Amino acid sequence: SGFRKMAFPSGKVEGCMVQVTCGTTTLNGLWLDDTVYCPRHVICTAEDMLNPNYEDLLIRKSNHSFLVQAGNVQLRVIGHSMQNCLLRLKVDTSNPKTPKYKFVRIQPGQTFSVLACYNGSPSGVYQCAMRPNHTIKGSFLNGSCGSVGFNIDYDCVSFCYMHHMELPTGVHAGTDLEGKFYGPFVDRQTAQAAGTDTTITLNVLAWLYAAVINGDRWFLNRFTTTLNDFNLVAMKYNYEPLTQDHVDILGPLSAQTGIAVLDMCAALKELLQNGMNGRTILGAAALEDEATPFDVVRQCSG
Amino acid sequence: SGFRKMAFPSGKVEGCMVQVTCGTTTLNGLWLDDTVYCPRHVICTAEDMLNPNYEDLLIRKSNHSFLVQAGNVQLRVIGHSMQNCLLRLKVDTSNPKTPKYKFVRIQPGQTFSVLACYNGSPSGVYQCAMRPNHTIKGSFLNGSCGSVGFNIDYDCVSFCYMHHMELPTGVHAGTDLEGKFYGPFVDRQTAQAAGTDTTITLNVLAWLYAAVINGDRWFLNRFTTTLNDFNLVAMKYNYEPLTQDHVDILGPLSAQTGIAVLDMCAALKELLQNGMNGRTILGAAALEDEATPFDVVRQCSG
């Protein structure tokens, strides 16, 4: 078979995307039960962003100042409040399509699926990784704010991201579903910049294991390396250090291929020093680090 | 903003995935109205594949020999037939979730979204391109047969692919939604092999235009080239020739960037001859050819 960075089926989530208009500002909201979540900067305007005070700005609003639409239909907001960077709007209608869900704060290195919306209307789904610097390399045009990232385990939607801002770098930033920012970032149009983006080492190995499982194994070697000697190389190449813990995770994949994680590290070390020299791995002129061990295992067995 | 190869929201299609069991063989079926479509090899068994005769094999079956389930529920098949490589099973229940749809035969170079299923249950969505050799580089494990590829224009699902086989290469093959194979391929476990896989030239330019729109423009140059001189290079590098027609398509993108398609070709020619020399385009150590002009435009404006 093969390996493609896939996203979870977006159906369950499409049924929760609504639209939230406030003054001259429109974006996307997440409708679960009778609460509609969304970025709090929906109450701001252009020069508001220069330096918003959300306490002042919000005190000057009422339920009636938020127009929300589910499809063409109108929902009536009957309460508002602020949670960190999110607005929580109570509404009369509970959502019939509300799925078994929960809010989780994802960790850096971990991946999730993004459902890009515009005006409460889903545009497309793609998968991505929460970088070590806390940015996602996504695709978000204007109006995409309030779009959510998630994962589906069984029948249960774990929401983990809502979009807010685009950084000067052209890379993105947002919050968990409690309005807490991933990263140092704030919701102001100011000077903030992304930290340095290190390669997710553990993810690059998972993907190598994926390649081996798919016959692409030209990169292997007889050598091995101690955990230390490896990190000493990794760090030169802007790679995340490797812990005996990351190594443990890579267990089942080592067992499935009879390749020792420390042998695989040696493989990686050679690729890092000698370069990839034209050849391709799973069809890439470069090492993929947005696929996690869990991702690879659910896609690579018999 | 950015650029990510996205897939269409899979919701409308998830509501059509059912399961089709026949003897010791289970796979996925596409339920629209009261017809359930699926690969005809559902009636085969192991050594049947060595050299099936679907006329014989099917004559020995009846409606009662096909168990189909929508979720946990059971549908009752009340008619069967064969269309090229597809089985069409009439059933009592029309599908409540049936969307505005249609069947289209996609052209090579064009892209579509795949919804990977197993046992009538959607596993994940990803986008991919129909290669010039008529294979898709997908991710399909055993049980994924009958999974569909599609595109959504407005509110209308255009189905264009159903999965059947995995080639020795580890690359895949299937049919349009009339059971006609894309490519020379047949549904027999035999020696068939994929032709040579040329790079979708038009798609590689669209993506360069995408990169320019995203500030990644280090690859441009003052030079230009005649359509001819370009193809003469392209062909050396296993690239699809370029027609004045492909060029016309690239119009709006040339107009949006003030970069002439023939100038962009010159850019590409240098990349093809001089190599990419370490640097990355839109974050790739290699040229992406599974994003079409249409794909790029819907994701790259203001």
Q: Is A272 left (phi over 0), alpha (psi -120 to 50) or beta?
A: alpha
User: In Å, what is the CA distance from A178 to each residue of A238, B16, B116?
Assistant: 32, 34, 32
The answer to whether A14 contacts B11, with C-beta atoms less than 8 Å apart, is yes
State the count of interchain CB pairs (< 8 A) between A and B. 124
CA dist A266 and A278 (Å) reads: 19
Nearest to A43 by CA among A29, A31, A57: A57
User: In Å, what is the CA distance from A61 to each residue of A54, A64, A81, A182, B45?
Assistant: 11, 8, 10, 27, 67
The set of residues, in sequence order, having a beta carbon less than 8 Å from that of A247 and lying 6+ positions away, is A227, A261, A262
Instruction: Give first-to-last CA distance, chain A, whole Å.
Output: 9
CA dist A15 and A121 (Å) reads: 10
How far is residue A82 CA from its own chain's centroid? 23
Interhelix angle A227-236/A261-274, nearest 10 degrees: 30
Question: Would you call A114 helix, strand, or coil by DSSP?
Answer: strand
Beta bridge partners of B25: B22
| Cβ atoms A214, A301 nearer than 8 A | no
CA dist A301 and A1 (Å) reads: 9
CATH 1.10.1840.10 location in chain A: 198-302
On chain A, the residues whose CB falls within 8 A of the CB of B170 are 1-2, 214-215
* Closest-CA distance of chain B to residue A45, Å: 19
Q: Is B133 left (phi over 0), alpha (psi -120 to 50) or beta?
A: alpha
CA dist B34 and A232 (Å) reads: 63
Rg over alpha carbons for chain B, rounded to the nearest Å, is 22
Instruction: Give first-to-last CA distance, chain B, whole Å.
Output: 9
| Cβ atoms B298, B153 nearer than 8 A | no
The answer to whether A11 contacts B14, with C-beta atoms less than 8 Å apart, is yes
Q: Which two tokens stand for residue A175?
A: 């919050």
> Which ranges of chain A does DSSP label H, i.e. alpha helix?
11-14, 47-50, 54-59, 201-213, 227-236, 244-249, 251-257, 261-274, 293-297
User: Which among B16, B22, B117, B145 is annotated as catalytic?
Assistant: B145
| Cβ atoms A70, A120 nearer than 8 A | yes
The torsion of the CA quartet A297, A208, B166, A127, rounded to 10 degrees, works out to 60
Nearest to A43 by CA among A54, A51, A35: A54
B7 → closest Cβ in A124, A140, A215: A124
Nearest to A1 by CA among B136, B54, B17: B136
Fold of B1-14+100-197: Thrombin, subunit H (2.40.10)
A125 → closest Cβ in B9, B166, B276: B9
What residue has token string 């092999």?
Answer: B193
On chain B, the residues whose CB falls within 8 A of the CB of A299 are 139, 141
The answer to whether A171 contacts B128, with C-beta atoms less than 8 Å apart, is no
* Closest-CA distance of chain A to residue B76, Å: 26
CA dist A104 and A16 (Å) reads: 17
The set of residues, in sequence order, having a beta carbon less than 8 Å from that of A132 and lying 6+ positions away, is A108, A109, A197, A198, A200, A240
CA dist A130 and A197 (Å) reads: 11
The set of residues, in sequence order, having a beta carbon less than 8 Å from that of A300 and lying 6+ positions away, is A1, A3, A209, A210, A213, A214
Beta bridge partners of A128: A112
Q: Return the CATH superfamily for domain B198-302.
A: main proteinase (3clpro) structure, domain 3 (1.10.1840.10)
The set of residues, in sequence order, having a beta carbon less than 8 Å from that of B62 and lying 6+ positions away, is B80
Nearest to A177 by CA among A147, A140, A207: A147
Long-range contacts of B155-158 (CB under 8 A, 24+ apart): B155/B99, B155/B100, B156/B99, B156/B100, B156/B101, B156/B102, B157/B12, B157/B13, B157/B99, B157/B100, B157/B101, B157/B102, B158/B101, B158/B102, B158/B103, B158/B104
Beta bridge partners of B150: B113, B159
CA dist B166 and B161 (Å) reads: 14
Q: Which residues of A are catalytic?
A: 41, 145
Q: Which two tokens stand for residue B68?
A: 């189909």
Q: Which two tokens stand for residue B164?
A: 């059947």
Nearest to A289 by CA among A242, A256, A254: A242
Nearest to B172 by CA among B158, B157, B161: B161
Which residue type, as a one-letter code, is found at position B57?
Answer: L
Beta strand segments in A76-202, E: 82-83, 86-90, 101-103, 111-118, 121-129, 148-153, 156-166, 172-175
Experimental method, per PDB record: X-ray
CA dist B222 and B218 (Å) reads: 12
Q: What is the largest CA-CA distance in chain B?
A: 69
Q: What is the DSSP letter of A272?
A: H
On chain B, the residues whose CB falls within 8 A of the CB of A283 are 137
* HEC assignment per residue over chain B: CCCCCCECCCHHHHCCEEEEEECCEEEEEEEECCEEEEEHHHHCCCHHHHCCCHHHHHHCCCHHHCEEEECCEEECECCCCEECCEEEEEECCCCCCCCCEEECCCCCCCEEEEEEEECCEEEEEEEEECCCCCCECCCCCCCCCCCEEEEEECCEEEEEEEEEEECCCCCEEEECCCCCECCCCCCCCCCCCCCCCCECHHHHHHHHHHHHHCCCCCCCCCCCCCHHHHHHHHHHCCECCCCHHHHHHCHHHHHHHCCCHHHHHHHHHHHHHHCCCCCCECCECCCCCCCCHHHHHCCCCC
Beta bridge partners of A143: none
B108 Cβ under 8 Å from any chain A Cβ: no
A299 Cβ under 8 Å from any chain B Cβ: yes
Question: Would you call A115 helix, strand, or coil by DSSP?
Answer: strand
A184 Cβ under 8 Å from any chain B Cβ: no
**Resolution as reported, in Å:** 2.7
* Closest-CA distance of chain A to residue B123, Å: 7
CA dist A172 and A164 (Å) reads: 8
Q: CA neighbours within 13 Å on the CB side: how many for A181?
A: 15
How far is residue A205 CA from its own chain's centroid? 20
Q: Which two tokens stand for residue A126?
A: 């793609």
Q: Which two tokens stand for residue B26?
A: 């289970």
The answer to whether B15 contacts A15, with C-beta atoms less than 8 Å apart, is no
The answer to whether A142 contacts B1, with C-beta atoms less than 8 Å apart, is yes
The answer to whether A284 contacts B286, with C-beta atoms less than 8 Å apart, is yes
The set of residues, in sequence order, having a beta carbon less than 8 Å from that of A164 and lying 6+ positions away, is A39, A41, A85, A145, A173, A174, A175, A181, A185, A187
What residue has token string 């407005």?
Answer: B154
User: In Å, what is the CA distance from A175 to each residue of A134, B62, B192?
Assistant: 10, 56, 50
Neighbour-count burial of A249, counting CB atoms closer than 10 A to its CB (0-12 exposed, 13-18 middle, 19+ buried):
middle
Q: Which two tokens stand for residue A156?
A: 């249960």
B85 tagged catalytic: no
Beta bridge partners of B128: B112
* Closest-CA distance of chain A to residue B279, Å: 11
The CATH classification number of A15-99 equals 2.40.10.10
| Cβ atoms B172, B138 nearer than 8 A | yes
- Would you tell me how many other CB atoms lie within 10 Å of the CB of residue A4? 21
| Cβ atoms A206, A250 nearer than 8 A | yes
CA-nearest residue to A9 within chain B is B124
Which residue type, as a one-letter code, is found at position B202?
Answer: L
How far is residue B113 CA from its own chain's centroid? 6
| Cβ atoms A101, A156 nearer than 8 A | yes
The answer to whether A141 contacts B6, with C-beta atoms less than 8 Å apart, is no
Rg over alpha carbons for chain A, rounded to the nearest Å, is 22
| Cβ atoms A136, A130 nearer than 8 A | yes
CA dist A123 and B110 (Å) reads: 19
Nearest to A26 by CA among A13, A49, A45: A45
On chain A, the residues whose CB falls within 8 A of the CB of B302 are 141-142
Q: Which two tokens stand for residue B88?
A: 């069409």
On chain B, the residues whose CB falls within 8 A of the CB of A302 are 141-142
CA dist A241 and A235 (Å) reads: 7
A138 Cβ under 8 Å from any chain B Cβ: yes
Angle, CA B235 vertex, CA B231 and CA B240 arms, to 5°: 80
Strands B156-166 and B101-103: parallel
Q: What is the DSSP letter of A54?
A: H
Nearest to B16 by CA among B80, B79, B82, B91: B91
**Mutation target vs B (from A1, A147, A276; most B CBs, 10 A cutoff):** A1
User: In Å, what is the CA distance from B214 to each residue of A86, A125, B268, B283, B284?
Assistant: 29, 20, 17, 11, 13
Nearest to A219 by CA among A301, A290, A302, A282: A282
Q: What is the per-residue burial (b if ≥16 Cβ within 10 Å, else e) of A189-207?
A: beeeebeeebbbbbbbbbb
B79 Cβ under 8 Å from any chain A Cβ: no
User: In Å, what is the CA distance from A164 to each residue of A20, A143, A193, B180?
Assistant: 14, 10, 15, 46
H or E element that contains A22: strand A17-22
Q: CA neighbours within 13 Å on the CB side: how many for B134?
A: 18
Residues after which chain B has a gap (C–N > 2.5 Å) = none
Strands A35-39 and A86-90: antiparallel
CA dist A111 and A113 (Å) reads: 7
Q: What is the per-residue burial (b if ≥16 Cβ within 10 Å, else e) of A256-290?
A: ebebebbbbbbbbbbbbeeeeeeeebbeeebbbbb
CA-nearest residue to A154 within chain B is B123
Which residue type, as a one-letter code, is found at position B269?
Answer: K
CA dist A253 and A296 (Å) reads: 9
**Mutation target vs B (from A13, A127, A139, A290; most B CBs, 10 A cutoff):** A139
| Cβ atoms B163, B117 nearer than 8 A | no
| Cβ atoms A151, A113 nearer than 8 A | yes
